[PDB]
Every structure is written in structure tokens, then in C-alpha cells.
Amino acid sequence: LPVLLTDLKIQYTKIFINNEWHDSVSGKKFPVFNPATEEELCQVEEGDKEDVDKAVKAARQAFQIGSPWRTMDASERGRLLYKLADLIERDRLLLATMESMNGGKLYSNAYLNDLAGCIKTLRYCAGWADKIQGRTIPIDGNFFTYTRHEPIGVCGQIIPWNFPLVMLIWKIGPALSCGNTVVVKPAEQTPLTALHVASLIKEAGFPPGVVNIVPGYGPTAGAAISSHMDIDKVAFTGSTEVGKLIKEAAGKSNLKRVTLELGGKSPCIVLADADLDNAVEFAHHGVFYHQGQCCIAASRIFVEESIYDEFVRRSVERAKKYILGNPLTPGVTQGPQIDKEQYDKILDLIESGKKEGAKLECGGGPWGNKGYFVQPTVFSNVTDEMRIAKEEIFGPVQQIMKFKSLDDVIKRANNTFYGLSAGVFTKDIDKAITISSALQAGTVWVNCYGVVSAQCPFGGFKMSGNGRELGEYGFHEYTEVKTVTVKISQKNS
Amino acid sequence: LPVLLTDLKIQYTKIFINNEWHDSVSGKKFPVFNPATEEELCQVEEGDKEDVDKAVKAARQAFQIGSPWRTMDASERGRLLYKLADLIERDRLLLATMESMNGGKLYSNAYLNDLAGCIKTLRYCAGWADKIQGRTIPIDGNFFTYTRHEPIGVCGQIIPWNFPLVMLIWKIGPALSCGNTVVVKPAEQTPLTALHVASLIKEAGFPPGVVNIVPGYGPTAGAAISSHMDIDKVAFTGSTEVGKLIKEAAGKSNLKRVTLELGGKSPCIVLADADLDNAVEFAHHGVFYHQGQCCIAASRIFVEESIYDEFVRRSVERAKKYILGNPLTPGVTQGPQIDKEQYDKILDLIESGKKEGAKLECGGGPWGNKGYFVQPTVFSNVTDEMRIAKEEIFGPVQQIMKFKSLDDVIKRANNTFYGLSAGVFTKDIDKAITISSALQAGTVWVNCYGVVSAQCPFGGFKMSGNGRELGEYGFHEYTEVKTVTVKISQKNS
Amino acid sequence: LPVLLTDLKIQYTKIFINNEWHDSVSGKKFPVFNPATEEELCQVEEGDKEDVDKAVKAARQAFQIGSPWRTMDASERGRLLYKLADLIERDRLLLATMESMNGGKLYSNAYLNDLAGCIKTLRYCAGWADKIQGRTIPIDGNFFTYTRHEPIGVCGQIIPWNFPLVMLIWKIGPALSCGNTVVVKPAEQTPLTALHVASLIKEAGFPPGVVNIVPGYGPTAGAAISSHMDIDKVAFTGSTEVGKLIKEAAGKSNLKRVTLELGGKSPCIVLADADLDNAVEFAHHGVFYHQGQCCIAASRIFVEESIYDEFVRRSVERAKKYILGNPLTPGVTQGPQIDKEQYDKILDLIESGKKEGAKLECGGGPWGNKGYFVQPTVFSNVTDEMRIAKEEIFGPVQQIMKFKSLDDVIKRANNTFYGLSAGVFTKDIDKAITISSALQAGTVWVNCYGVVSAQCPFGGFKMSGNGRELGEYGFHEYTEVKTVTVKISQKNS
Amino acid sequence: LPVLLTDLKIQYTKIFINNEWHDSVSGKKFPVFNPATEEELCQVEEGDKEDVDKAVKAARQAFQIGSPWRTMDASERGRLLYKLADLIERDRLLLATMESMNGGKLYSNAYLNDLAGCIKTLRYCAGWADKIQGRTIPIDGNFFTYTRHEPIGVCGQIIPWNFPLVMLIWKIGPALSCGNTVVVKPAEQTPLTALHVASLIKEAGFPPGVVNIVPGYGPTAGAAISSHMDIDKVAFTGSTEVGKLIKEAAGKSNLKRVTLELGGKSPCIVLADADLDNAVEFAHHGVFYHQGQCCIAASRIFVEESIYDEFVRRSVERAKKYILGNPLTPGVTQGPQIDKEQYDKILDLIESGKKEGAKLECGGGPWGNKGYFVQPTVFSNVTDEMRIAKEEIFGPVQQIMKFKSLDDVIKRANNTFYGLSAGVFTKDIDKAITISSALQAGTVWVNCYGVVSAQCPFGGFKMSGNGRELGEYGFHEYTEVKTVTVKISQKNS
């Protein structure tokens, strides 16, 4: 069971460059807030273009040929990553409590799901460190040809606020495993866990300048990271508008490599032959997980007509059993929304759903005076023209849509520009294989949902992002291929 | 549709060495018979130890460093294989007719299933020719390490009689693609198609000595191939007893590499939720294909109790629709057995099945005065202790067994020393995945049977054989890994 | 030897959509000229936004689920590619002559290097067609996870004029092999060979709409291809400025995948221990190949000080043996420049080199009143600040630079924003590996130059492009990964 | 620096079955001796056929479907291997001292070379644990086909005495990583370190029965392991005669998979252009490492004629600087031989070399009254017909042979039935590549020797073994491929 949380004292609130702690060049500090109580946790140094510039200088120096990080053995890189994972596991309680407090997330989920995933991903990347290999090629003519997979260079990574630690680890695992150096920009809502992890990275024994962390504001620091000319690759997780902005900024400077992890409107199809209890439980989990603040949240629940009513009824009942309170309080299953802006956005989208004429089963309003709490909400009879069926709500709002024919529901689920995930619930094998082949989603789950692991590559199809993460194919993205061809006297098979 | 067969004239009946035709040293020639009418086709030169030694000398000389075959480009090897496949496709009619006459197999099956499979396998291997690659390894220390996949050397291959052309192609495809040279020994029952293919190989433009064919008797020629010290690898397809002898002989001399493909008592499980018509059709196809002369033939049809009777009834009716006659005759679907020894063995096994007390539904006796025809036969109420449930009949005899609980049938199907194949018929995803995981078979088929393609690796568990064929893993077997490590001044990631 | 060229009649001058020939919507036709004689070959239909839109509609319809191209077997795609390659080999003479006339390239080089490379690349892609595979993943929990590599969708490809057929094949090989559909835009200078290949594609038996070709002007047709919302991927080969524009336009529209091939200022290092004759011959070949109109042309010839003088002298002698004349004339080694704009650009760059104070050893002016011919040119004592040492000349101009220290020359060669290729000439084993590791180029040659093959991946590092082509890693670029995870009752190792 | 050794107390001297310590069924115990002083260390239980049978029963029960080891996650297997490696690193001193005492090996080499290699190999295998993957195959027809790589089953491993811990780890790393269960038979000379590691394995938390260790005599316990029918695979490291016997015995029983790691007569070619000091140092190291008791020991030192004499002189001087004494004593560079039988065999081979007429430079006789020490020995003018040039001496005896032509020395080095290793010393890239391609050895070193790491596969070519170890290809050997093909309604690319 999770261990009781203790007093939280925050000491790391600065810019982490060259294994040192620097104040911002301008000298400005922005506050950070607690969603559960609307209180300032602390102040954090505000990074801008100068800080990003000096961080990139430090990383570029650390990436030079002959530097301690470039001549280091790959097995040693894996060893360093394992030591970092062990250090994280040592401080599991403090990191979980900081994640819960800062990001307004349930302590049990911030302990048994977040840090476990972080540790597993770190250890997986550490295992992959010394096992990615080039090739030897049977080229025509008297030649000996091979290909090496080298680190790309300097990678600038932009983290979202919904999973600070998990996304941070997913960004700095494959990057450090392949040998790159990173300058990371955490979200302005949740910058603390990344700074503590930076202190742990310094303790672990990474060479100075390998990992640098600049906390600031996205429009200034993130733009500087994306428009920098000395940065070789940029990885970004967030909204599609900022994703387009990042892509265009990269197109305007240095033609750097770009990896995007944008959002999506994930459908969850339930067929007449599916197990009803499992389907209900996993649909509720898919839409209501982490207060609905997930990129892969099942927002459009397609349910076959013959079992529609019953499903809806049970769904309603489940939404009533959800309890809403302070994250650190035991027994709660839903915490507050991240900040006031998303809170007001969710309220506006719920009101728009009511205005467009969608049946309201449970919820549909705010909860509590202090904090940002929204009641679990269910919208039935959602048509394809409603805004709640098109725009990513990113909140605890569930839509239940009806269908009769399989081809029609396939065309409906593929009728979007979001291709991040999909879910199919059925007992048949032919239906499962056919639907999983037909759907245009980066990940298709069958009889389950929200199942992510470090091994399986993850990404979006159409506009949910470019590239994949968490896998051998994910590790492919952080390396550059160099081909060497040597003229030899004579070749033999 | 298949094109009408023509007159057959057989010219190639000698030993094929160094792209030449040699009489055997002993001067002895053994006849070859036609199963349909019991007539001598022609006399074929009888290979022996001296002929095998001569062929091995030729192949070893053709494998020397700097020889035309060793300096040849891999793409050129693929080009030669494609030319061989086009030449085979040019002579599809003559090869199909020769296969039908020699092996006693239906002309339609010899044309639409054998030649097509040979062509597809040859083209697949030709594609693989120049795409197998070594690796570059991140070894510790200031070293640069890579690995090359080289041809093993001389490979002696022993072919069965049930699929002469198909097995010959499966042997000389991966071997020639990886650059090896082959000395093959065809079955004494069906030597002619391999000799015609040898003539085609000479026409295609392979360097002399790359492919050598020695037709003879297994105890003399096959043993000489297996006991030879110059031969580097031996591949053998045939019975388990001869395979045991081959493995022991290889252990005695030269410690050569051994690949064994042996038979098996393949189960075929049909569950209550399976589609009855498809299950009946594919079980009938699986047991009765090629007069049951297949290594993967479904010999133990486990059928769930609640649907037992009905299934049996339908099965019986299907076995009555089988027509037995001359292979070249249109409209026939079953030909004669390969030779009289197997014919009498099948009759003895049927009589023993009758004696042990298994219900006889259809067949159980010979057909026709001239030929080696056995009526299609069905045995019901087959228990685990019966000999027909333990010994590979290799004839058109079908056993139907009853079960109730899934775990019991799993233990029954795994209670054997054969692991070649299996088959599951069901409409449920969970049952399909569970059974396919829990079965100890090299290939598991769900809702189908007898589906073999050049892309998927093929092999057996337990005593069914060692190694795999027809795939990247199959191409792994015909290569040897050489690791080269070079001391360098300094290494960088 | 190359067969004698014959008369040329050009019938294919329209837009190729849905295996049909359409006039442009506007109705305008632009002429195409012959560099050797400055004569109009014929008028070609001028494609614009409407033509691109209807071609993309046709391709999208051809890519629909259940269409003939999507249900077709991968082996059948390989078969179609092989048939296309055979059809090309049948019309080798006409295609070589058309390439020589349109692109102003030597007939011997067109017949022996362009057509052979196209055929080899097509056959290599056809082999790769049915051998790219997903994976099965040992995910945690009672789950079964696999990954499929599907075609991306519609791919718009933009071809340069220096290697029309070769680049066209390098584009439509990996795209059709993975199952995608293509809308290609040929260069306005050389559109004819692509149209003839389109007619051959129709003859081969590809389904309608799989391949579409729109000839036009880049600022109108290429921009419409790069900004189209429906198009899934864009591949572009050309100048860095247009590539920057393509990247920005893709960032503005639906965030399509982008592959870029851009030029570079490739260095060629010659050390004191290198074989002088081979180094001289291959440096001359590297810089002067195809009138210097190559992306990988060795523009900066670094030569060690102690062997500088002699090398230069020998180089001068070689440049005097180069003969300049009409491409179809036998015995010529250099043809005309592609068009007047590049011709004047080359003359201006030569004059600027003269002005900045580089020693002129041979050439430096035009040859011939009729045509676009520039004498082979040699510039010695080139310093790092001269424009001829920074700006890609794309003409028969050679720069010879001097160095003394290995580290300094490494820094000089890496002191650029181009990373396309590099060349090292030495007899040592430590120097070769050290320099090949230390150079920031996408392809490093040792003791050779200009060695390209379908097997080895090809691409640029910093601003020479993104991604790779011609290889397994190249085939990785044209596929999208879909992860399917199924909840199972129980998993076993 | 190595830490000072302490008092050694040995408590583990029994048979390790089902995470328990059992006395032998017979009740007999054989002593174990210390080579340095010829003293009994302790008595170890003597395993025979009954003990092997019950160990195989325990392992087979542990391998059953649904058992804790089979349902365990692959990441958990890697975690267990990492915990075992950490436990070994905790007891580095005791294990190093036990290895030094039992095997008569230098304490500094036992600490800085054996324990480090064991830890690195264990961590490498633990990383590989959850990263080996099946495939999904584009099979023809409306089918979905994939392949899983399952554990083979029960593996019986036979360890030599030269590197007890290192070979034990090389055996139980890939076996446990792929999920198999092991019954291991250690050498009768050095059984103690394996027993201590077994106790550590029990402490780490492996399920009972996963690892079982039976110490005994090779002719009885090893034969029982190799002839057992319930055993699925056998891996054996040792002499070629016993390997031949193992292969034949396996061919007589249940056709189990066989992996052999036999000996070799490794050449070491030194060319005129090689660095003399590095060549001398690494040749001396290669021949004299671990008292010459290595499978890859460079026994035939081919040196080019023009630099022969000088090399020999320097070699002689190096052999005089070797110091012979007790292993635990600091400063010593050579310990005693393993036991008296090998000691007398080495003396007999030295005497035979003297008799056949080979010039004796240094050594050639015994050293010390108590112990099994042999003086470092150098034999010059060794011809191809001498027994010292053919038979693996396995002792500190060095042969120096002369050559003049590269082709002749290539033929000489390939004129043998051993193919384990080779070494080339040169400063030329063309010579290095040519010789490394031409040599028939499983591992070719350039300008170095005796460089082994967990990443690079290791094995012999002709009669030095069958298979590879320590790498992805090495991990291929411990898995079986199962192909699953499912009939689907319709397939799409």
C-alpha cells in the first residue's frame, strides 16, 4: 500500500545548467499554485532566450568529440540510467507527494501509476542503451559498407503539465540512452518535480552539461528552444496549435528534426457481443482517468443500439460512485483541475453541450468553493455535429453515441483529423481483427483501454503527432545514420 | 484453368555434377515406377559413396575464395534465382506432368499448388538474397566491432518423395541465396523432377559446381552425404528414424550442422462455438490432402462432445463425396499412394485400427486392381491408446476423438513426442489466443489449416525436427557469423 | 557497349492521372528545351492547383480500404515492380536517349549508369516489398501486443532535373513497395522521361490512381502539393531554400510528414600516405561527374601540404584531358549545363572566384557559341573565406585547399551547415576509422567517391536534408506504425 | 585496486535442487584440491543419474504452463537478473578468492577480469530479457500471421574449469533471460564458485526449480544430462572429444538441441608493417593469458620473415620477465596449472616438441616442488608437421612460425579443423580487410587479441563448436519460434 505522505519542503526552484543552479538573467520569478487549495507553492526562476542560449551552449560543449560523455561506453550510459532510476525509487514518497500537490493528482495514482511507470521506462531505456546496432551491407562492387547509429546532437524537449514526471522520463530516457544531450523546458504549471529530478541527475553522476532544465513560459522559452539554430532536434508534447507553431518555427530556422505528440478525440467502440461489465468499467476508466486530462481519453463512446440503453444506465450509475475531493485525502477518486483556465474552458464546453441539446445524465456543473473541481459529467445522445464530439474537452466529460452498422461506425470514428487512439470491445475474433485493421489510430486496444508500457511504441496518426515513442522504433527517432563505404582489394560472400 | 497435359519424354536420368551429366561409377541404374498404373518410367543412374565424394569435391572447389560464385554480387545471386524461377515458369506444364506421373498426384494440384509454390518460394529467396545483413556492435573499449553473415559452405540435402519439387525448392532457395553450394540427394521414388530442374539450373547460368544432384538409394548415398567430412551442413527431410540416424552419423564425423524436418501426429481441435461448415471442410482438407501423405496432416481430430455426432455425420458424407481414380484424369480428387510398401503399411494400419475396436464409418479397404489406391477412410471413437492415434499413418485415414474440458484436450494434444503442427477452430478471441499459446506445436492455425507460405517460418517442436525454414529465421540457418574487432585510436558515440 | 542511339519521337506530354492522359485545366503548355543545341523539344501540359487537387483525389480514392491496391498481396506489389523494371529494361535505349537529350547528359553515362541504377533500385525495392515486418512485444500484464507497419497514405514527391529517372525511381520505389500511392511533380526542365515511365507504369498493370504525374512549374504545382490538406507525406529533392519553404508550408497545413534532400559542400580529404593516382582520379570524378551537377560533388578538395603541389599539377593535367562537346557524340566526357540560368550562375561564381583572388589553373570561361558549355575549371589556393568555398556551385569548378594538421582539417570540414557527404584517402587503418567517425557527414567514403547503391541508406546531416533513402532505414520512412494490444485471459512466456 | 583477500570458509558443497541443498543419492563425496599447494579444499557431493533425473523433474515442473516462472513478466526476469548481479557484486571479494584458490588463478585477474566480466554479462542479459520480439508477417491470402519466440524448455549446461564463474554466467544468462530453466553440471575440478552462486540465486528470489546445480563427474553426471529424454536442450563447453560424444549421445536420445563450445588452435599473424611493441605485447598476452589455459589461446604465431628474428628476440625477453608463484601473492603474473593430469600432459607435449627438433628459447621444464607450475616456454622454428603446431597444448607454451607470402600463410592458417579465433597485426587497411575476410575463424581480431565482451557473439567455425554466445544471435539459440496464422475476413496493407 502507499506510504503516508510527509511534510513537503521545496528547495529546487532555479534553472539547472551545467549541473549548477542559476538565477534567471532577467531576475524575474513566477509563482506556482496548488490546484486543490489555490495557494502559491513557491516561486520558480523564469527562463527566457538568454537562459536557453547558455543552456544550449553548455549542451553543445558537452556533446563535443572527445568529451567525457562522447567517449563513455554505452554500457556506462545504461549504468548511469539505472543509478538514476534507483535514486528515483529511493525518493518515491517525496516525488509522489510533490506530483500530487503540484499537479492536483490523486496520491494513490501519483504513487502506484506515475512513479512505477517512470522507473520502468528508465530501466527499459537503460537496457536499450547498449543494444542498438548499425549494420553491414552487401553493397555491389569491391566495397565494405556499414552504417552506424550516432546520437543526433542537442535535443530540446517541451513537457506538458498533465504527466510531468512520466513525460519528462519518456523524453530524457531515449535521448540519454542514444547518447544525446538535452535542454528541457517544463510546463509553467508544474515545474517542481523536474527540478528535483535534475538534482537527482546531478547526484547520479552524469557529466556536466548533459542534462539542462530551463523552467519558464512557453511563448518565450519554448519559442527560443524551437527557433534556436544550434539545437539539432526538438521534441514537443502539448496542443495541436502550439504543435503547428513549433513545426513552422523549426521550418524557419536550422531545419531541425521535429517530434510532436499532440492530442486526439479517441473513440471507444462497444459492440453487442462485448462483456458489458468490463466494457463499462474500462470505458469509465478511459474517459475519467486523471480527471479526463489525458491525450488518449476516450471522448466518443460509440455503443451499439441493441445494448445502448442498458450501457448508458450503468454508466450513469458508475459516474455517481465517483468521489470528488482533495487528492491527498484517502478514498478520493478525482482531484482538481490543473488551473483556472482549463476549469473555465471545461465549464464553457459543458454549457455549450447543454445549449446544443445533448441529454445530461450526471454532473454538468462546478463543485466546491476553493479549488478547481468539476463534477463527473455524462452526455448522452451526442450527435456528430456537436462541439463536444469534435473539440478535445480535456475534462471529466463523457459522450455516449449510438450506432447500428459497423461500416458506418468505422467511417464515423475515422471522420476526424485526430488519430491518437481507439478502443474496441467484443468477444468475436473476426470483428476484432477487422476493426483493428480498419481504424486509423496510432494505438488500438481490444477489450481494454489506457494500457501503455515502455515496450510498445506510441504515437499519433494524422494530426495527433509525428513519430513514435517508448520502443525500439521510438529509439530510432533519436539517432542519425552514418554510412561508411571502404574500397577493398577484393570482396567475398 | 490448368492447360492440357501432353506427351512426356524423359531425357535427364543421370548424375548432375559440375553442370555435366555423369554415369554412376558402379554403372548400376535403378528403375522408377508410376504409382497410377505400376509401370516403369525409366532407369536412373544409382549414386553411391564415390559419386557423393566427387560431387562434394566439385562443390568445395566451387566454394573456394576468389571463385566466380564467391566474388559474385548478392544482387547477381538474386538475379540468377529469378532467372531460374522464370525458366521454371516457362516449363510449368512439363514439370507438373512429370510430378503427376512420378509422384502419383492430381494434375490440378500439381499445377495450381506445387509449381506456384515453387515459383513463389524461389522469388522470395531471390528477394532475400541481397538483404541479409551483419551488424555493428557498441563493444566496450576503444574498439570497432562488426559481424558478417557468411555462407556456411557445402550443404548436403536429402529430399522426400511426397513433395519433390516443393521440398527441392525449399532446400536450394535459402542455400543458394546465402551463397552456399549444394549436393542434393533426391528420393529414390521420385528423382526425375529434380533432374529436369538441374538441367534448368545449368541453363540459367549458375557457375559450374554450385549445384550438384546425385540420385540414388538412401542407405548408400544418403549415409555417404551425412558421414562425409568435407560437407559442412546437412539438411534432411524424412522419417524420424532416418533423422535420428542422420543426427548420430553427423555426430560421429566432422560435427557438421544438422537440420531435420520430421513428421508429426498433428491434432486439430474443434470447439462448440466454431463454424461447423468451415471446420468440416478444413479438417477434411487437412487430413485428406495429397492422400494424407503430408507431414502436417491433421491425424487427431478432437471435437467437442456437444457437437461431436453432427460433425462426424457431416464428415462421413464428405468422405463419400471423394472420387478415386487416375491423377491425370479430370474431376478426380485423390490419386494413388506413392509405392507398394506404403500401400501395404496403410492397409496394415487400417486393419490394426479395426482390430483394436475403432468404429469404421467410411472406407477401410483397397480400391482398384491396378494402382496403389486406398479408399478414403474414417475412424470414429478413437481413444488415446489406439495405434492409429500414436503412429503417423501417412495415408487417407481420419481419426475423430471426443473431449469435454479444454484443459484435458490441451494435455492430450501435448501428450506426444511430435510438435509439427496444430489447429484450432473457434469464434472466440480469448479461447483462440489461450489455446494457441498453450499448444506445443511449431505452427498453430486458427480457423484454417494447411496454410503454408514462403514468408512464414516452418518447423517442429520436440522430436518433429530441429530448425526452421521459409523465412528470415529460416535464412538464419544457412549462414555463419564471423565477428571482426579492430583496435582504434579512439571511439565516440 | 552502348547500342547506337536512334530517332526520338515524343508522344507523352500530358498530365497522367488515373492511368489516363489529361490536358491541364487552364490549358497552358510550356515548352522544354535541349541544352546541347538550345532547341525546343516539345510542349508539356502545365499543371497547377486544380490538377494537383484532382490527382490527390484520385490517389486518395485508390488508397481506400477494400480497394484493389489495398487488398493486393505484398508479393504481388513486388511482382508489379519487377514487371515495371523489365519493361524499363526493354525500352533502355529510348529512355537513355530521352535522358541525354532533355538533361544534356552523356549518352554512355545515361545508358550505363542511369538506366542500370534505375533497374537495380526498382528490383531492390520489389524484393523489399514483401519482407518488411511488424513485431510482437512482451508487454507487461495479461496482454498480447503487436505492431504493424502500414502505408502512410498519399505521398507527393518533387523531383530535380539532374537525375530525372534515377530520382524518380528512388521516389516511387520505396513508396509503392510499402503500398502507398504517389502524386509526383517532375522538374520543369526535364519532364519527359517521367511521362514515358508513367506510360510504362500503366502498361505494367498497376491499379488506376496508384501513380499520378503532374508536370508543371514548382512555385505553383509544387506549392499546391506541399500545402494540400489531403496529402499525407511530401518528399522533396532540391535546393535548401525551396526545402525550407516546403518545411514551412507543411507546418502550415495538416502537419504532413516531410522528407528533404538538399545539397552540400562536400569535402574530400587526401592525406600524405594516400595512393596518389587513385586519389587524383577519384577526386576528378567526384567534382566533375555529370558536369558537376551533383548534390554530393566534392567541392572542397583538402590536400595535405607535403603532397599539395604535385597533386595540383596532376589534377591540372587531368582537367586538360576532359573533352567538351555534344552528349550524343561518342568520345565526349562532358555535356552542356542544364539551362541558361544555371549556366550564367556558374559563370558569375567563376568570375567571383577570380575576383576574390583564387589562382586559376585551368578553364574559367565558356566554351562554344551554341549550347551551355563551361570549360573544366580548377581553382587553387582556395581559402575558407572565399565564396567558392561556401556556396554550392553545381558546376564543373574544382577547389583545392591545403592543410597540415589533422584536427584542423577536421574542424574545417565540419565548419559548415552542410552534412551530405565526405571523402577520405589514406592507406592507414587508424586514420581512416578516426576521420570517418569524426566527420559530420551522412556518407563517408574511404579511398573511393561517388559510390551509391540501392542497399546503403543515403541522406544528409545538418541542413542537407532529413531522413534517409535507398535502404531498410529508407523503407522505414514510408510506413506508419500501428500498435494493437489485446487483453487475454492469461499470458505465458 | 583489488581489496585484500580474507579467510575462506566454504559452506556450500551439496547438490542444489529446488532452492534446497540435498545430499547425493549414493552418498559419495569427492574431494577438491588447491593447485597452488596440492591441498584438499573440501568434499563435494557426487552427482549421478538419479540426482540428474530429480533435478530435471524439478526443472520440468517449474517450466509448466501457469507456473510462477512462466507467467512472470519479462521485465521481472530482467529485474531478477539485475538483483543477482548486484548480489554478486556485493560478494566480489569472497567469489574472487574462491576462484583464485580453486582454479589456481591470479587474484588480481580473478578480481579485475572475471568478476567484472560476470557482472557485465549478467547485466547485459538482464537488459536483453524484455527486448527480444517476434514478428508479424505479410503472408499471402486473407490471413494474419505472427511469430513468437518462446523459451525452449529444460537446458542442461556443462561447464569447464578454466573460467568457472565466467562460463557459468555465460550459460545461465541467456538461458534465464529467455525464460528457460537450467540444470547445470560444473567441472569436477572447480565446483565451489557455482555452488556459492547457487546460494546467491536462492537469495535473489528466483522461483524454486528454475536453477538447479548438480556437482559430480563428467562421465556419469554429464552423460546422464546429455542422454536424458526430458531435457530439451544441452549446452556444453569443453574438449572436442567429449563434445563429439555429447553430440552422438544427444542424437541417440529425443533429438535435443545441442550447443558446443570446443577448443581451437588459434593463429596470430604479424606482418612486416605492424607495430612491433604492440604486436609483441598482445601476442605474449594471447598465448600466456591464464597460464595458456584458454580456448582462444594464440598457439601458432605466424611472423613475417623480414621481422622474424627481432620479434623472437623481444618475445624471449618478455617470457623472461614473467614471474611464477602463488596466485594470492601480489606481483605474480602466472599461477599453477589446474591439476596434475594437465600438468603432466603439458610436460609431455614440451618434451615431444624438444624431440621433434624445435628450438627452445625459454623454459621447457617444471618449476617448484609443491604445486603444478610450468615455466613460461617459447618454441621457435616450429614447422607445420610438429605436434606442438597441431594439438592444443592448453599450457604456457608459445610457438613462433615464419612465413613470407600472404596467400601461403592464409592457407596455412586455414589448414586445420579448428576455427575458433584468429589475430592479424598490421597498419594497412587493405591487408586488414582482406585477411579478416579470408580467414576461417569465428572471431578475427585486428591489432589486438583476447578482446571478448557480452555484446559481440562468440563461437567456432568448423569443429570448434556449433552456435554462438554473448549477443542477440547468442540469445537466438535459447528460443523456439512458434508461428500462429489466423484466418481473417479481409486483410488490408
Ligand SMILES: NC(=O)c1ccc[n+]([C@@H]2O[C@H](COP(=O)([O-])OP(=O)(O)OC[C@H]3O[C@@H](n4cnc5c(N)ncnc54)[C@H](O)[C@@H]3O)[C@@H](O)[C@H]2O)c1
Ligand atoms: N538535386 C538538385 O538538383 C539540387 C540539389 C542541391 C542543390 N541544388 C541547387 O538547385 C539549383 C537549381 O534550382 P532549381 O529550382 O532549378 O532546382 P531544384 O533541384 O532546387 O528543384 C527544386 C524542385 O522543387 C520545385 N519547386 C520550385 N519552386 C518551388 C516552390 N516554391 N515550392 C515548391 N516546389 C518548388 C521545382 O519544380 C523542382 O522540382 C542549382 O543551382 C543548385 O545550386 C539542386
